[PDB]
Design a protein around this ligand. Structure first.
Ligand code: ANP
Ligand code: ANP
Ligand code: ANP
Ligand code: MG
Ligand code: MG
Ligand code: MG
Lengths: 372, 47, 372, 47, 372, 47
């Protein structure tokens, strides 16, 4: 085989490339869009469906739908379109001659992984395939073998503790709270100023606002009190049509739902307490090393000040002797893909692929005894 | 006692939602801009 | 203080009266009109503006303006005229000795409520005031503490789930689709028969046509097929000048935009699907009681057969074992006002008013921590 | 070889978790039922 | 004094009644719940706290809290609410005129007994009080003075070997593995099929699923192979909102964590090996009688087929000439309370009560030298 | 008579045993420390 492909196809963003590369060759949203208006002009080369960046470019006349929700594929018909775009339009490669390494969140339904295997082997005819946990790959990118990875993508937040190469599955925790929920929450709270973004294209607009302007407060009540003097924290954003909106305390109420899920009406603990609970569920002798190597990954962990806030909240929970250290590499977005490209290029990993011979022998259920 | 004034923000016209410029024929949808930035619209009574 | 006033200031209608009454004493459209022609008769008692029913009577020579659009005041200079008419002309009361309970849709801009408070305290000098959610009051008029209220007025549609006294704000949904949009859509589709209603007075004429003849089909496609052999479903309506128009399949294509917003070019879900989503966004254990206590309120839900259609659609969405019950009181047009009158006369509510002493020391922003 | 098919189970809508019917405006949440029992929901592409 | 009371305050369930009765008069979960939502209706009698069955009924709007974890009280403020409900609301009795026989698991912290004594004597003013070991009481219900009691409840599993009237404290073993851990494990393994029960009320839903459908396989690997042909072992369960789930091999993988604690990541041996170790830690001459009188008790031991599995494993460990007998009554769930009621009504037990005079002259530490 | 008070010790979270911080979602596991050293945890009622 020529080389292996790595497809970190998360809930919100598809990140594809080749093993051995230090950056994904193609990054585009996991979006399939179809026109919602009357096509009057004959010819024009119109399409019944648009995928990825093409859907974003013409999202005004399009209804955008995410095939993945909460790390779980809800519509496999659009997932096949997403993967076909990834292979033949973005990477411009034939899957028939490249092993493919996929990513999945832990505690996912087992049928979701099985259909991944089935589609990779029977529709794209990949010579080999593997499914790895997103947070495990982030540890490969960091170069560590010990530490807890707090991965926050677009649909799923999950923490996986690892100590010298041994993962503790009983301590793995999962929160269905991520960038998509924060985008919806920002859409909700922006109505306090009269902004009424409702459509899916306006959902992308609000996602852009969130990525550009939302930030994590070190002290939420202090930042609220400072924002009561509403001239300093306020920022302007220009809509695609030219109208300018102003955002204020919403900028830090925007990520605060990660640390106070009760803002979303949810009962679960914040991401800081999730990591602390995951560390406490591990062995006593290994918690000290988990505190010093708490690694952040995923697109949602890119908020400014999220590392300092995670540091602050954890040291107030953990015993005062421990040296709480939060590692937030600038490549936090692509940490999963970099780890996947490292793993797929390892010499010791080449016998861990699910071979097409093994798929013929065992079927889609092979993935449960071969993968994590 | 008198408190200074409640300033209603300029309306932002989305694709569909809270505000539209076509809703009231009796109101002129005047543009509101501060500095160079156009903050939105407000419905004056001329048309 | 003598008694408390209740004013249901919706987008299209103003409904005012005294607390403890079982029906509003004054009901008139929330319309401010000004003449659009040359006055030539000297004297005659001419005046520069007309409000409410007087504007409707003189609407031929008048340009009719709705100060409220989508439940949000767009021109306060005319909303103040609406309130002045309501107090000094319709109710014939002095506001300086009556607490006033107003209504507002959820997810409204915060400045809209603040100016309500400021105007009520600084121009009408009311001893106390309060702002309540429209759908919350509709549950009061239903004699219930558990159920989801689907309120459809002239400007907004909103669903508020409540279970044994506690509302779920995260599950509250809002649609900017209501009777005004349906009136404009009926104006649009009536042009297929050559009827060309364009002016605001003709908008009122089309609103009357909609209120008298529009109705909800139980099966839209079957009703379209029945109306294809056009004999029976056609009805005659007489314009105020004596010319009579005939309306056919438009009668049920008229409310169908509520259940198929794509008729208006909108991407949002129908009123049936929004209610189902609002129920499903609540806790699992309370959904069963929300299904059996779905309450319809507001003037837009007054279409004949709307309750049967809502029961039919929700039954197809909800699990088969749930008993879907749609409660549509005959007086549900005034359900918000009745709930406001019940609430304003409750003994325990008398310490929840925003007092004049409280507004003096805190200003308009007091309304946010008092009302909701 | 070709194995028959991986049948994706119907999604169970809990209070907060893996699935929700409001997530995708482009997907209609059609009810899945076998016998008289509602197995859950799946996202058809019509709305 | 009128009569003695017996209160079996376990980790998850409270069983209260009068001494001499053959069944607890009041049984309700040991739960304190508080509302986690807004609350918009005035009046309605909205209490800020709910206890027992009322909290379970209203759990859709409440955050459910167990004041007891692993048989140890973690929050005494809610434990006092549990006891107040037990006395005044469930039993409808005045504690000032009834002795109270409490229960506790062995190897508990000594301060846990002391605060029980202090609360019973200072806040409830009970004339007398006692704290008996749960497993010792279970032997009373069996009518035996010899045998080893395997007691598993919601938070604690413990074995107490008892020869003729004499306990062997050095042979008493304790596992912090019980029904709550099994409920959490079932919650985590149901995600393989896509079920995402996360809230505290959904924890009770999963507990009901566990109580109704979980069972102990006689041969785990053979039953897994049988469930591989997935048509026969699957069962349907209808959630409170009408959606029905399907559970298959999880039905017997659910209780298997009792016999293979490594399923939970625990290093400890199973309950079968715990009993065998407890028997082997006793004198050689008494092991024969402990094998023939292995009493099974507690609500966790109510899984179907658990007695047959316990017999199967212990026969494999014990010498072949021993006649292993697993004594599982139909009332294992109430064996502790029945034994407590028997003990509290014995004439010879009347001088073993901690008198209010003894508490006055000795303090809470009287419980260590008087009880056990 | 009244005796001063029974002070329940702070809970020590071992690998597996008497106490865990994840057991009750309704309780916040506040750190208990004296002389600057952590003695354990206690379950306050806020979360
Ligand atoms: N600068 C940013 N600030 C805040 N949020 C961001 C930023 N960049 C990306 N995000 C969020 O992160 C998402 C993408 O992160 P990514 O790591 O690609 O998620 P994923 O892997 O697609 N999802 P999952 O499978 O659930 O891990 C975006 O859609 C946003 O929600
Ligand atoms: N019989 C009817 N059939 C159909 N539509 C009707 C009928 N009567 C009234 N309507 C519609 O309902 C409107 C009035 O409803 P109402 O409950 O008074 O709305 P509102 O409270 O003024 N607005 P909102 O702010 O959305 O609550 C009318 O203007 C029509 O659009
Ligand atoms: N029929 C059943 N099948 C399986 N598990 C059950 C059944 N009935 C009860 N349980 C479990 O047992 C628990 C109750 O047992 P119980 O003996 O009342 O515990 P407790 O006395 O409250 N706690 P402990 O301090 O450990 O004795 C439930 O909450 C379930 O976890
Ligand atoms: Mg990811
Ligand atoms: Mg209304
Ligand atoms: Mg017990």
């Amino acid at each position: 085989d020529i080389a292996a492909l790595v497809v970190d196809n998360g809930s919100g963003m598809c990140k594809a490339g080749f093993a051995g590369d230090d950056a994904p060759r193609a990054v585009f949203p996991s979006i399939v869009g179809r026109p919602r208006h009357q096509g009057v002009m004959v010819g024009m080369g119109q399409k019944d469906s648009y995928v990825g960046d093409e859907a974003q470019s013409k999202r005004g006349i399009l209804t955008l739908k995410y095939p993945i929700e909460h790390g779980i594929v809800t519509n496999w018909d659009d997932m096949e379109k997403i993967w076909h775009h990834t292979f033949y339009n973005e990477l411009r490669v034939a899957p028939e001659e490249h092993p493919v390494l996929l990513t999945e969140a832990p505690l996912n339904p087992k049928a979701n992984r099985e259909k991944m295997t089935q589609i990779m082997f029977e529709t794209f005819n990949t010579p080999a395939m593997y499914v790895a946990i997103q947070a495990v790959l982030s540890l490969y990118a960091s170069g560590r073998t010990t530490g807890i990875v707090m991965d926050s993508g677009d649909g799923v937040t999950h923490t996986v503790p690892i100590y010298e190469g041994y993962a503790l599955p009983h301590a793995i925790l999962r929160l269905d709270l991520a960038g998509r929920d924060l985008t919806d929450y920002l859409m909700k709270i922006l109505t306090e100023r009269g902004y009424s973004f409702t459509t899916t294209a306006e959902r992308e607009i609000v996602r852009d606002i969130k990525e550009k302007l939302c930030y994590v407060a070190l002290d939420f009540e202090q930042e609220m009190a400072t924002a009561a003097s509403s001239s300093s924290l306020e920022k302007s954003y220009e809509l695609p049509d030219g109208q300018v909106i102003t955002i204020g305390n919403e900028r830090f109420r925007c990520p605060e739902a990660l640390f106070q899920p009760s803002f979303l009406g949810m009962e679960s603990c914040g991401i800081h307490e999730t990591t602390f609970n995951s560390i406490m569920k591990c062995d006593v002798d290994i918690r000290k090393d988990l505190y010093a190597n708490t690694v952040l990954s995923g697109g949602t962990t890119m908020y400014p000040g999220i590392a300092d806030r995670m540091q602050k909240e954890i040291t107030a929970l953990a015993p005062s002797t421990m040296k709480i250290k939060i590692i937030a590499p600038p490549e936090r977005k692509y940490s999963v893909w970099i780890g996947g490209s490292i793993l797929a290029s390892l010499s010791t990993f080449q016998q861990m692929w699910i071979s097409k011979q093994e798929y013929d022998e065992s079927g889609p259920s092979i993935v449960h005894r071969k993968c994590f | 006692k008198k408190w200074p004034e409640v300033k209603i923000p300029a309306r932002i016209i989305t694709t569909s939602g809270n505000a539209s410029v076509d809703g009231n024929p009796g109101y002129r949808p005047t543009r509101v801009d501060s500095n160079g930035e156009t903050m939105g619209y407000e419905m004056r009574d001329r048309v």
